[PDB]
Amino acid sequence: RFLKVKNWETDVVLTDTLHLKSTLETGCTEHICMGSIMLPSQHTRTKDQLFPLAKEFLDQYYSSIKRFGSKAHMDRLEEVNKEIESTSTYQLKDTELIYGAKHAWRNASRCVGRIQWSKLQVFDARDCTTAHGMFNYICNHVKYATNKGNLRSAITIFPQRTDGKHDFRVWNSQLIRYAGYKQPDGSTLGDPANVQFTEICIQQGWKAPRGRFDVLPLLLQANGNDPELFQIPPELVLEVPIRHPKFDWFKDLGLKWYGLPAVSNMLLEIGGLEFSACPFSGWYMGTEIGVRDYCDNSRYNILEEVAKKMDLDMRKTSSLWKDQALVEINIAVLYSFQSDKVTIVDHHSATESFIKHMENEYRCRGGCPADWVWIVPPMSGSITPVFHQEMLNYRLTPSFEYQPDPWNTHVW
Amino acid sequence: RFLKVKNWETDVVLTDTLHLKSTLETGCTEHICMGSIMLPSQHTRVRTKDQLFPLAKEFLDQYYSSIKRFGSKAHMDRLEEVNKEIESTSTYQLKDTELIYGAKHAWRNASRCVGRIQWSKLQVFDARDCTTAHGMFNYICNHVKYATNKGNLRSAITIFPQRTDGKHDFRVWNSQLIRYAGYKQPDGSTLGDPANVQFTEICIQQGWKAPRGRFDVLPLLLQANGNDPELFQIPPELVLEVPIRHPKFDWFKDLGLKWYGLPAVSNMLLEIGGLEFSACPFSGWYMGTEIGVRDYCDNSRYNILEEVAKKMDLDMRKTSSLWKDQALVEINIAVLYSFQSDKVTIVDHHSATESFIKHMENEYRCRGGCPADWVWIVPPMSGSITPVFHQEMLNYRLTPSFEYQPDPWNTHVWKG
Numbered sequence: 001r002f003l004k005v006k007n008w009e010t011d012v013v014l015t016d017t018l019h020l021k022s023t024l025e026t027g028c029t030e031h032i033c034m035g036s037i038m039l040p041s042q043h044t045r046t047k048d049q050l051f052p053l054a055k056e057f058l059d060q061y062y063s064s065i066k067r068f069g070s071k072a073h074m075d076r077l078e079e080v081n082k083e084i085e086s087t088s089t090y091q092l093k094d095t096e097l098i099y100g101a102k103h104a105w106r107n108a109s110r111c112v113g114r115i116q117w118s119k120l121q122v123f124d125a126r127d128c129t130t131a132h133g134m135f136n137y138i139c140n141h142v143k144y145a146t147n148k149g150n151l152r153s154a155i156t157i158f159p160q161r162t163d164g165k166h167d168f169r170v171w172n173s174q175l176i177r178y179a180g181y182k183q184p185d186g187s188t189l190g191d192p193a194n195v196q197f198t199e200i201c202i203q204q205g206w207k208a209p210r211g212r213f214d215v216l217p218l219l220l221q222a223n224g225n226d227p228e229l230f231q232i233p234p235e236l237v238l239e240v241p242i243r244h245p246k247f248d249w250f251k252d253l254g255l256k257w258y259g260l261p262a263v264s265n266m267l268l269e270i271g272g273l274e275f276s277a278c279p280f281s282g283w284y285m286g287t288e289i290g291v292r293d294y295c296d297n298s299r300y301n302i303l304e305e306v307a308k309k310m311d312l313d314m315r316k317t318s319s320l321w322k323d324q325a326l327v328e329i330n331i332a333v334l335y336s337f338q339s340d341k342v343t344i345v346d347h348h349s350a351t352e353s354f355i356k357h358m359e360n361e362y363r364c365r366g367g368c369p370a371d372w373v374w375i376v377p378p379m380s381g382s383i384t385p386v387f388h389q390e391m392l393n394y395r396l397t398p399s400f401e402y403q404p405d406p407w408n409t410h411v412w
Numbered sequence: 413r414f415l416k417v418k419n420w421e422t423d424v425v426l427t428d429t430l431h432l433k434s435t436l437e438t439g440c441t442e443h444i445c446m447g448s449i450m451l452p453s454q455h456t457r458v459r460t461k462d463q464l465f466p467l468a469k470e471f472l473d474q475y476y477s478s479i480k481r482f483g484s485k486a487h488m489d490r491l492e493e494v495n496k497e498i499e500s501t502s503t504y505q506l507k508d509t510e511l512i513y514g515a516k517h518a519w520r521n522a523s524r525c526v527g528r529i530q531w532s533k534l535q536v537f538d539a540r541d542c543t544t545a546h547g548m549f550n551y552i553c554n555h556v557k558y559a560t561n562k563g564n565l566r567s568a569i570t571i572f573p574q575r576t577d578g579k580h581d582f583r584v585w586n587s588q589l590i591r592y593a594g595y596k597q598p599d600g601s602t603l604g605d606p607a608n609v610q611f612t613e614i615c616i617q618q619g620w621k622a623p624r625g626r627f628d629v630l631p632l633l634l635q636a637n638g639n640d641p642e643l644f645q646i647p648p649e650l651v652l653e654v655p656i657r658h659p660k661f662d663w664f665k666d667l668g669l670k671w672y673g674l675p676a677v678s679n680m681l682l683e684i685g686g687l688e689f690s691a692c693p694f695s696g697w698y699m700g701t702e703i704g705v706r707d708y709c710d711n712s713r714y715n716i717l718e719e720v721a722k723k724m725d726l727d728m729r730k731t732s733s734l735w736k737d738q739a740l741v742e743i744n745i746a747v748l749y750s751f752q753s754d755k756v757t758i759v760d761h762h763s764a765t766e767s768f769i770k771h772m773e774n775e776y777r778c779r780g781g782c783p784a785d786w787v788w789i790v791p792p793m794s795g796s797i798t799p800v801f802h803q804e805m806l807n808y809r810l811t812p813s814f815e816y817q818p819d820p821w822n823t824h825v826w827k828g
């Protein structure tokens with residue numbers, strides 16, 4: 001009940017007590033571990049269930065500010081109880097909303113970048129009423145977060161769900177992503193991961209420039225209405241041309257990527273309240289672009305072309321030509337972002353940062369929920385310290401959760 | 413109940429029903445996932461007739477189902493015979509056929525093993541008539557010679573007598589049959605394999621004269637029938653080794669690296685129908701990354717990334733040059749090059765993971781499932797350019813099984 005985790009590279013042993021405060025469920029049982037299931041039913045999302053959730057959240061909020069069991073605490077519990085009995089929901093104080101957003105990041109067990117959790121810039125967009133207003137808020141976020149390459153973490157929080165018919169949703173999975181179109185010859189142009197979304201953009205009325213790296217438009221749904229298209233001003237989208245510090249032919253590949261990773265399709269849960277539109281952003285770890293975006297077989301899948309340009313022996317997999325090109329591709333991404341002075345972290349620094357964060361969380365908080373399947377980078381896993389680090393995965397709230405894609409849900 | 417797993421690279425979806433036949437625990441609960449804990453208590457291993465009949469019956473039902481004789485008179489007589497042997501003697505003996513079946517299926521059920529496509533072609537050596545440490549040495553030598561096969565490696569397992577009262581255990585004190593010594597220097601540096609320092613000290617204390625080199629093959633330390641272990645040197649002509657060179661880098665040979673060809677795990681416990689075989693060394697062939705990534709490049713192992721990157725003239729001042737990643741690829745190229753050039757069986761992580769995906773799909777269709785530990789199956793480099801990274805996996809415990817056990821020097825009662 002008081003669990004130990006060991007680091008097998010350093011023999012460091014940490015004692016976790018924080019999991020005992022876990023609310024939500026893992027999907028595992030004592031008979032089967034689902035540790036590698038991408039999105040079990042749990043990680044996706046009445047008057048009765050709402051007040052215990054509010055009480056739990058307010059109790060931890062007032063404990064964090066050392067006013068647990070204080071006048072202010074009891075009065076707020078009273079007031080929220082009062083408001084819930086009446087309105088069947090409630091509204092967060094600005095201070096509680098900031099707390100809940102920072103702690104939803106702090107509790108994101110799949111996030112390696114959480115050492116930064118406390119410096120999040122929270123943009124309260126709860127007064128937004130239309131898609132045009134959502135657009136305005138999202139442009140201001142992008143510009144704030146981008147900061148001429150000196151990226152700053154940010155979240156923008158639109159009005160909470162009420163009855164589920166009045167949902168605010170960003171239909172894009174990230175604020176900035178490249179279009180994907182199926183080809184007449186059978187292949188795919190651009191990002192294959194976004195073929196379905198790119199079709200719905202045209203189906204909703206986009207005029208695609210059918211290129212390879214076309215920044216998708218935003219598809220914004222306010223108050224449960226039909227969603228609307230808006231183009232992000234190009235001057236707000238910081239992109240990096242990808243070149244290599246050795247291979248001069250690298251630039252001829254035509255590669256670029258955007259500076260700002262901005263997840264926009266998740267659900268933020270605070271004190272039982274649900275924020276279905278809550279785009280957040282930080283900065284990339286290099287492997288997200290170079291390993292996953294560029295070399296996944298279901299993505300831009302450039303390995304075969306880069307390997308040819310390197311004149312590697314691609315006859316037999318045992319020459320490790322894939323691995324050799326993978327490393328060079330990732331050297332170039334880091335090289336390019338650093339050259340253009342756009343914030344980026346390599347997987348060695350980020351994972352070392354996370355070990356220090358874990359140490360801090362165990363020491364000051366009693367634990368740190370962590371999903372090893374996601375924390376370990378997708379290349380060079382065992383030469384990063386997280387590979388040898390035992391982690392306990394459990395679900396704390398406030399949290400970011402997954403939600404169904406809107407087009408499946410939207411009553412039109 | 414059905415359970416579906418998806419491959420996120422190919423959208424293939426599979427349905428698991430085999431998890432219903434799962435007996436042991438995982439360590440996880442609805443409220444915590446222990447999926448990255450190295451040795452949960454549930455994976456580690458004094459057992460009465462009470463709980464033993466149902467373990468034997470479950471195993472024998474499985475066995476006779478596989479041979480299409482479920483409910484036959486042979487099946488019922490065997491159940492009756494095992495029943496009476498337990499109540500009369502408090503344990504029972506496996507037939508040869510049952511032992512072979514159990515050992516193959518313990519491999520088949522090993523959810524952390526990526527090499528399981530080969531599970532049906534295991535050579536089982538019955539050493540249950542062994543009585544002394546000298547006998548164990550002889551059986552192990554024959555295992556090494558057979559499995560090595562001049563570089564054309566063959567999977568094999570040698571099964572020594574099962575536990576009785578836990579006071580007469582057969583144990584191989586080595587974690588692997590062939591491993592290099594590690595020596596802690598007075599200045600704090602380590603000569604040889606840092607992973608084997610403690611075991612090397614035991615061997616030295618037990619009378620081993622250590623050559624004190626960087627690649628000294630450790631002696632076997634063998635315990636029969638609960639007696640104190642005895643030292644034996646594997647005959648060097650039986651230990652196939654591969655000098656490591658690089659196909660393009662001529663200076664790589666001058667690093668002085670070599671490795672042995674035969675990976676042979678010797679500290680695990682084989683569980684079959686509730687019988688516990690505490691000495692069951694088994695061997696296959698290497699996946700390249702086991703040597704080139706873990707053995708050579710772990711900070712806690714030979715840790716040669718620094719020297720290799722130095723010799724490659726890489727930018728080592730900023731980690732974001734990915735000089736560690738670059739040197740790691742070159743080393744793994746060299747391991748695979750060296751083994752193939754010497755015609756010693758090896759498999760690269762691309763081939764092995766691709767084969768495992770095929771094995772896994774086949775197991776879903778013909779068996780209803782394939783328990784798999786993603787944390788262990790995904791290779792320690794280049795994870796997502798292998799197909800297992802994108803593959804959802806269900807981890808559960810089936811028997812027969814291989815289990816961890818405590819290191820014998822922590823539990824042994826010394827006679828002297």
Ligand code: HEM
Pocket residue numbers: 104105108110111112113114116120153154155280281282283284285288345350374400
């Ligand atoms: C500041 C630098 C940041 C870095 C380097 C970083 C890094 C990462 C990485 C590599 C992943 C793995 C996901 C993937 O591979 O697609 C991840 C997941 C995640 N990140 Fe962070 N992130 C950062 C900022 C943030 C912020 C600001 C938030 C929220 C406010 C956040 C919340 C999350 C969540 C919720 C997930 C996983 C979603 C899930 O449960 O599957 N991250 N992050």
Ligand code: HEM
Pocket residue numbers: 515519522524525526527528530534567568569694695696697698699702706759764788814
């Ligand atoms: C034939 C070629 C084989 C290959 C390529 C292979 C590969 C591997 C690898 C790479 C691992 C994880 C290695 C690590 O510790 O980093 C593993 C684990 C394992 N292997 Fe296989 N293996 C093979 C044969 C066998 C055989 C013949 C057996 C038993 C009869 C076996 C049983 C196991 C078990 C039980 C584990 C899990 C150990 C644990 O739970 O920690 N393997 N294998």
Ligand SMILES: Cc1cc(N)nc(CCc2cc(F)cc(C#CCN(C)C)c2)c1
Pocket residue numbers: 038113261262263266280281282283284285288
């Ligand atoms: C803020 C941020 C920073 C960063 N450096 N990187 C990301 C993108 C990684 C990410 C985060 C997340 F919250 C969800 C998903 C997803 C998905 C779809 N699928 C893989 C499950 C990806 C986001």
Ligand SMILES: Cc1cc(N)nc(CCc2cc(F)cc(C#CCN(C)C)c2)c1
Pocket residue numbers: 450527675676677680694695696697698699702
């Ligand atoms: C037969 C075989 C083939 C192969 N290719 N490779 C191995 C070694 C991998 C292995 C197997 C095992 F059963 C246990 C351990 C261990 C350990 C100690 N600790 C890290 C958990 C390692 C064995």
Ligand SMILES: C[C@H](O)[C@H](O)[C@H]1CNc2nc(N)[nH]c(=O)c2N1
Pocket residue numbers: 008387388389390391447448449450787788789
């Ligand atoms: C903490 C973690 O469970 C531990 O480092 C595991 C990770 N995955 C592994 N996978 C393999 N094949 N071998 C290992 O030793 C490990 N170590």
Ligand SMILES: C[C@H](O)[C@H](O)[C@H]1CNc2nc(N)[nH]c(=O)c2N1
Pocket residue numbers: 036037038373374375420801802803804805
């Ligand atoms: C099936 C498996 O869970 C899936 O491929 C996961 C593995 N680990 C991951 N880890 C990260 N960081 N991001 C991912 O998208 C995934 N995908």
Ligand SMILES: [Zn+2]
Pocket residue numbers: 028032033034035440444445446447
């Ligand atoms: Zn689990």
